[PDB]
């Protein structure tokens, strides 16, 4: 798993065309999204993560949380992102691991949002200036 | 070299604190920037690129130019980014590569922009979201530098 964390003033998206023959189904409400004062997590689920979804998710959960806590972020946004790696996990596996991360962050008490999986999305983001507002991590099954 | 291309409505940044001890010197104007209808190139210069700076730059200038054409981008922005790779090039090599790509892009006729190297920066961006507004590329040297 390749993660990119951006502490942002906001994250906003708008669903466009599908990027997969059969993307995640979504209601009208889910077509647009917006969060403010949020740590945005751009995540690429990798092929090697297929070996241990749980371990990967748990560790990913822990890292996002630590950072979310370090920068004083109460809102976290999970953003399916396929461009932080070239060894991508198949869709169904990535979606599952992404959901587990989302659930685990919700479990920790964070106000958590997510963007629909499998669609091209126009999006707006504003990274804060500070030293910890732009971090990257690599979580993989040991 | 790892490159993340974002065709966006605009890009804007503002320098904050310094990320490196000896960061690139800058003028007053280089502190803030804003460019419209631009293909933004976030680039992580890697260790393997040190093997042949000129070659890797030409290969990156080529790819970036190609994508700019596919989306009809008249504006291009070179954004120094250290998070697309875990095996980064030294500060000087990266600065030389980035400068070469920035310059190569100007020569290809594009209106080019850039954000200062080695500085934490706040930035805003707006991906257009069409099929080719989010793309990534991996560029590396094949031959060894001769000089
Ligand atoms: C390869 C292209 O022709 C194809 N349209 C494509 O984009 N596939 S993809 O791997 O980029 O994935 C498309 C979208 O499905 C979701 N997706 C698929 N695989 C992953 C993954 N491994 N990690 C995160 N998101 C993924 C994301 O929304 C991603 O943007
Ligand atoms: C030194 C750390 O505390 C700091 N977080 C850091 O990331 N430094 S760094 O070496 O990754 O690079 C900091 C900044 O210098 C520039 N930079 C340094 N190395 C590279 C590189 N290999 N490719 C692109 N930019 C780089 C970029 O502006 C990058 O954001």
Curated annotation (Swiss-Prot), chain A:
Q: Which residues form the signal peptide?
A: none
* Record localization: Cytoplasm
Annotated segments matching region Editing domain: 1-142
Domain of life per record:
Archaea
Self-association state and partner proteins as the record states: Homodimer.
General function of this protein: Catalyzes the attachment of threonine to tRNA(Thr) in a two-step reaction: L-threonine is first activated by ATP to form Thr-AMP and then transferred to the acceptor end of tRNA(Thr). Edits incorrectly charged L-seryl-tRNA(Thr) via its editing domain. Deacylates correctly charged glycyl-tRNA(Gly), but neither glycyl-tRNA(Gly)(2'-dA76) (the terminal 2'-OH of tRNA(Thr) adenine 76 has been replaced by hydrogen) nor the 2'-fluoro tRNA derivative do so, strongly suggesting the editing function is tRNA catalyzed.
Give the family this protein belongs to, as stated in its UniProt record: Belongs to the class-II aminoacyl-tRNA synthetase family.
Quote the entry's note on domains: The N-terminal domain (about residues 1-143) is an archaea-specific tRNA-editing domain that has a highly similar structure to Dtd (D-aminoacyl-tRNA deacylase); the domain binds L-serine and L-cysteine and most D-amino acids but not L-threonine. Editing of incorrectly charged L-seryl-tRNA(Thr) by this domain is tRNA catalyzed.
- UniProt name for this protein: Threonine--tRNA ligase
Q: What organism is listed for this UniProt entry?
A: Pyrococcus abyssi (strain GE5 / Orsay)
